[PDB]
From Swiss-Prot, chain D:
Note in the entry: The unstable catalytic diiron-binding site within each subunit (Fe1 and Fe2, ferroxidase center) also serves as a pore for iron uptake; the ferroxidase center is labile. In the iron-loaded BRF crystal structure additional stably-bound iron ions are seen inside close to the ferroxidase pore. Mutagenesis of residues reveals other stably bound Fe cations in the interior of the BFR shell; they may represent a pathway followed by Fe(3+) to the central iron storage core.
Location of this chain's protein in the cell: Cytoplasm
Family: Belongs to the bacterioferritin family.
Cofactor details (free text): Each BfrB homodimer binds 1 heme group coordinated by an axial ligand from each subunit.
Protein name listed in UniProt: Bacterioferritin BfrB
E.C. no: 1.16.3.1
Organism: Pseudomonas aeruginosa (strain ATCC 15692 / DSM 22644 / CIP 104116 / JCM 14847 / LMG 12228 / 1C / PRS 101 / PAO1)
Keyword field: Cytoplasm, Heme, Ion transport, Iron, Iron storage, Iron transport, Metal-binding, Oxidoreductase, Potassium, Transport
């Protein structure tokens, strides 16, 4: 395994570890508030990041690297829906930037299978950014109270 | 086939081509904004127009004319939901005036089969006018924020 | 969204718009002549270009560009089977060149998801080029009258 | 022959059902025209329910050898928005319900207990409708008109 | 919506409302007399008139008129079977004339969709006339008592 | 029933009776030569003219006219496939001229039900003309021998 | 194929063409009068004649003769039920006579397959005569009015 590919994979893994926990807490926060539709969506976002982290770990081990599950960066926990959403979007913009940089490096050292893995994850982060931006646009078009209302029942 | 009948059929065809693209863009714009119910409905109007164009094209060829799929008129693209709906309405008002003129002419040269085709297309356009007026009317009764909220989910 | 990426996507979109109409007319002309297998095949090629255009449109909007459905370039309509197939082929040869330039660009600016979309479109257009070259060669191998005979029934 | 005054009361109730049938059917269609499909559908079923009540009256009248009267159509109360339409329906049912009660008292007095029974079933049904109508009007006040109509766009 | 179109639709509606009541009473009369087959058939006629009225009402509201369900013309109630049949027949010959006049006017102002609705209704009144004349002929061919006997059982 | 409407119905009916026998005989001549796909198809054209004659007869009778089945016009019988197709084509062009004339007259005396019937019949005859011109066109494009070959098996 | 056999076959065919039209118009007259049971029975007799004419056409073509579908003999149309049934019988007595002579001739020149086909047709015409004589019998036994009453419903 190329040494820097493995550092980039561990970096992306560290970003997923953060998103897993952040999305999971935001999910349960929305469930505690009775916003059950947001809560279920956010749960599914968290599970998706668990699956990404799984593939990164398996790839790092195959490359005879040491996956790092020990270092957990900073969770961005919001205190209301508008902020929680904005916090997910800020995490995703950072994650996406780290992914692009990992993919440049993989391309450069001809690790095309790691690059393919990272590109599938990048596509799924960009779908999430699409979700998030649409939600924040909806809060402006329908009003915050209507937006929350629409997210009470599953 | 009557030469003028064929110009009228191409005229109608040209108008369907415009509505296909306009409704199709308006659909995808609504989806992008998270108003999926509007997006789904408008997708279906686009497909309906596709199906009318197909039958125009087939009639023109049976009559031994040359279907004109080269000339694309002006799309009326809205910038928000009330504009988009009004744009679609303005386009249907014009399509329907053209459909009436074509039918007058078909009757006068006794092309009753073209006439009947055009009559089915008109009745469908009039149902879309019905839908569109009703939507603009709902926006006034329930208010724009409610109207949008009601179209967030399919 | 990168502004040159978006311009490339609109350029590809413009090519798909041309292909959709050209193939659709070509399908209906073949059906008008009783060459129903050609006609059904070209119908499916048209529908495929429609799906590509839809994905291009969704991507542009996600990158916050303006999809351009207004500008419709030159349709190459043949007047017999051999010309129609050659027209479709000339069109794909140009479509495919624009796709390669567009991918080079998306790669350079790290828009790997756009690259991925374009690469799928490209695979689908190279499949269409395989079919076209194959039909041209069969005309030579079995003679035009037999070729056409073989395409009367679906 | 049935009792003459019974037959007159039955034709009276029948007159009230003919009005409700037309009024409810027009309100339903106006609600559908406006995209308030859920009000449209419910009101349609109210019209249909009155059509069935009218059928049973017509049948009973003929059994008692009277002449069902379908020629005289009293005055439709047509509202011009949703709150008005619900209040018009309600005004009609308050009146229908008073007439049913008088018709039932007469039936008892002349021992036509089968006619009483038919009217008691009509009455229960018209009282349900009154429950529905006052509930909607109460909901307009609790959730606000705009929300209320919003909740009735879709079936 | 054309003022005289609406007036004509509202006149056809008036004829439908008379027919609903007339056919319904007549059904119930035949049932009270034990001619259940006649009763069942007249019940179905009534129901068809109620469906035509529904369509007229919906068309009037689309054209932005006021449906008139207030004025109720005069029911032709028969006192025996032969008379009940002739009465429905006189009423149908009238409806049929008014429909023809409504259709002339629709044609002349190009309200072709109203015309097509009117034509469907008219086709259905002509079927009812076929039935009614046939029934009157049968009374002469088989005699009244046999005709009535034949209509006792559903 | 309008007297001239009835003459026009009888005229159309006579045309149908000619088509029934001509198509039927053409069918059985194709079966006898072992061109079964032509034979099957022509059989179905004959059945269809049988259904049209049925509808004309019923209408004529309802209008109190006398259906004329006694007079049978001149059958156009070809002696080979190209001639048979052209004969069927010459017959349909005539039927179709007579249909238009009958429709003018029904419009002018307000028999809109007769007109609807004839109009269905006219659309079905134009579909037949489409099929016929396509076959003669295929003969030229694939060559007579290939065209017949392709019609050997059902 | 023997020349006089072909003449006979063409003669029987001609009789079947008269029956087809006569029975079919009778059926539709009975349906127009509301005597649906007679109408359905008579419809099936017309269909059976159509099938016989098909077999005659087929055999004539096989034997290298020209089926004659051009020369339609005289239709016996009754004005009422008893006449209509007597006209069918008169027609069948004549048909039956011609069949006998055709069969003598087939036998004499040894065309035993032609004789078998005509024998099958004869048996079916004799079944028809049985039905016809039975109906005329019943008219006498149950009275005309009862007879007609029993044929209103199918
Ligand atoms: C490295 C950290 C984690 C990894 C790699 C991980 C991985 C996974 C995987 C592969 C699944 C199966 C998902 C599927 O295929 O449907 C899963 C499920 C799940 N995870 Fe995690 N997970 C992690 C952390 C967490 C945390 C911190 C929580 C909660 C605080 C959590 C809660 C859940 C729940 C509730 C499920 C569904 C379990 C069930 O009911 O079957 N996970 N995880
Ligand atoms: C000449 C212009 C066009 C014609 C004649 C046409 C015709 C058709 C027809 C006949 C269908 C099948 C619909 C059905 O029966 O269900 C269809 C489907 C479709 N069209 Fe078009 N169309 C046109 C332009 C477009 C454009 C500009 C778009 C933009 C994307 C588009 C997008 C689609 C999509 C997504 C489908 C459904 C494909 C599937 O998933 O099966 N079409 N079109
Ligand atoms: C005039 C007094 C009327 C009576 C006694 C009457 C009676 C009935 C009855 C007994 C039914 C069957 C309902 C069921 O069992 O589900 C019915 C159905 C119906 N009625 Fe009426 N009706 C009347 C007037 C009207 C009028 C004025 C309209 C106006 C449009 C109307 C519209 C309908 C419709 C649309 C149906 C359902 C028909 C179907 O699609 O099956 N009715 N009526
Ligand atoms: C040459 C004269 C005719 C021949 C040889 C002929 C032959 C046939 C045959 C073989 C069938 C299919 C019957 C079966 O197998 O079930 C048929 C059906 C039929 N024919 Fe004729 N036919 C003739 C003329 C007529 C005429 C004058 C009429 C008048 C209307 C008519 C009306 C019909 C009808 C209604 C059917 C049933 C079609 C369906 O709906 O499937 N035919 N004919
Ligand atoms: K709300
Ligand atoms: K060949
Ligand atoms: K009897």
């Amino acid at each position: 395994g190329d040494k820097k590919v493995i550092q980039h994979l561990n970096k992306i893994l560290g970003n997923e570890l953060i998103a897993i926990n952040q999305y999971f807490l935001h999910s349960r926060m929305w469930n505690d508030w009775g916003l059950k539709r947001l809560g279920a969506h956010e749960y599914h976002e968290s599970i998706d990041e668990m699956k990404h982290a799984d593939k990164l770990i398996e790839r790092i081990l195959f490359l005879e690297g040491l996956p790092n599950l020990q270092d957990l960066g900073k969770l961005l926990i919001g205190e209301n829906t508008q902020e929680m959403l904005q916090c997910d979007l800020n995490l995703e913009l950072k994650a996406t930037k780290d992914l692009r940089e990992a993919i440049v490096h993989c391309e450069q050292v001809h690790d095309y299978v790691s690059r393919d893995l990272l590109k599938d994850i990048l596509e799924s982060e960009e779908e999430h950014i699409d979700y998030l931006e649409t939600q924040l646009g909806l809060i402006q078009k329908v009003g915050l109270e209507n937006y929350l209302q629409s997210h009470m029942h599953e």
